[PDB]
Write a protein that binds this DNA or RNA. Structure first.
Ligand SMILES: [Cl-]
Length: 345
RNA sequence: UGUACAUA
């Protein structure tokens, strides 16, 4: 009603305050114009008691606001000015339905904002609800962002249950690594968890490495292992890539994994890949020249020339050059061997 | 000539 009146001429109630809303918070918070009023007031006010004047009403109506298209923004703003006592009341208002809020488009942003802002005891209280639904939650279109947020903002020892969920069955890190949302959880885990946690997670990735490497989402998991795994992980991967260079290079997704090995590898890593690329089986064209005729592997050769040492390049040039005008015959060869003219002049 | 990552 005051809402319906304020909507008429908004800049005509320019002296409206937060405590003039104190019975209409629900209607205001669920209204496009009303929620923008509340937010603009919370951001401009330097008055703790005006802000707290509707806070009791935000708490009382929280469960109806957290998954509202406009109310979720209102609830979130009340994490921006508290300390623990103010954060604890908010968390209590929602804690019991956190298992559902994590799956919801709007309410999941309240859960993320809470983890962003509240102290660690309160974070752990939110995670204790997530424990119940964590497997579903990891690969939910909404739930994965809450799990990602947990891994980024909570110390590693209190997300152990998330890591143990990735390891809950033999096929779980595979299942997660090929899921469009699950794969982001795996990547956050490789970025932020302790080596005690990432070791068995990476161990499982190695077991089904080829499959994950050529999956449209798993290839990012493998790339994150190359960057965030141990020196011994990079060695097991470069070694396997080198031994199967042509097969990795000629497939859509796994070709990016070689490029990552080239980009992040040390000199001896690059040496093993160039070595495999230049081996000439007594009855065949060298692997590198075949790679240059392939829709994906030609980009891998280009990445090679760009990242390897001059002496490793010399080995490539001396193996390619007895076969070039034979390569211009091929489709896009003109543009392929032109991008490499820099190294043939 | 070849790949992702969410709210008015
Ligand atoms: Cl949804």
């Amino acid at each position: 009603d005051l809402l319906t009146r304020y909507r008429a001429n908004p800049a005509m109630m320019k002296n409206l305050k937060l405590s003039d809303i104190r019975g209409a918070l629900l209607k205001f918070a669920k209204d496009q114009v009303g929620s923008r009023f509340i937010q603009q007031e919370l951001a401009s006010s330097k008055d703790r008691f005006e802000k707290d004047s509707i806070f009791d009403e935000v708490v009382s109506n929280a469960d109806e606001l957290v998954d509202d298209i406009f109310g979720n923004y209102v609830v979130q703003k009340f994490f921006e000015y508290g300390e623990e006592r103010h954060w604890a009341r908010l968390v209590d208002a929602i804690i019991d339905r956190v298992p559902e809020y994590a799956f919801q488009m709007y309410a999941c942003r309240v859960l993320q904002k809470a983890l962003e802002k509240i102290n660690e005891p309160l974070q752990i209280k939110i995670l204790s609800q997530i424990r119940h639904v964590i497997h579903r939650c990891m690969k939910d279109q909404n739930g994965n962002h809450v799990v990602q947020k947990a891994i980024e903002k909570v110390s590693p020892q209190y997300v152990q249950f998330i890591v143990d969920t990735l390891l809950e069955s033999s096929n779980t890190i595979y299942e997660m690594s090929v899921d469009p949302y699950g794969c982001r959880v795996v990547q956050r885990c490789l970025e932020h968890c302790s080596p005690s946690q990432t070791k068995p997670v990476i161990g499982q990735i190695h077991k089904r490495f080829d499959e994950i490497a050529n999956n449209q989402y798993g290839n990012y998991v493998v790339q994150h292992v190359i960057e965030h795994g141990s020196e011994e992980d990079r060695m097991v991967i470069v070694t396997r890539v080198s031994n199967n260079l042509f097969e990795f290079a000629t497939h859509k997704y796994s070709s990016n994994v070689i490029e990552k090995c080239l980009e992040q590898g040390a000199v001896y890593h690059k040496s093993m890949i160039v070595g495999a690329a230049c081996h000439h089986q007594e009855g065949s064209v060298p692997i590198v020249v075949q790679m240059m005729k392939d829709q994906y592997a030609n980009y891998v050769v280009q990445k090679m020339f760009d990242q390897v040492t001059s002496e490793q390049r010399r080995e490539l040039i001396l193996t390619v050059r007895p076969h070039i005008p034979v390569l211009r015959q091929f489709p896009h060869g003109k543009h392929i061997l032109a991008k490499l003219e820099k190294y043939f002049q």
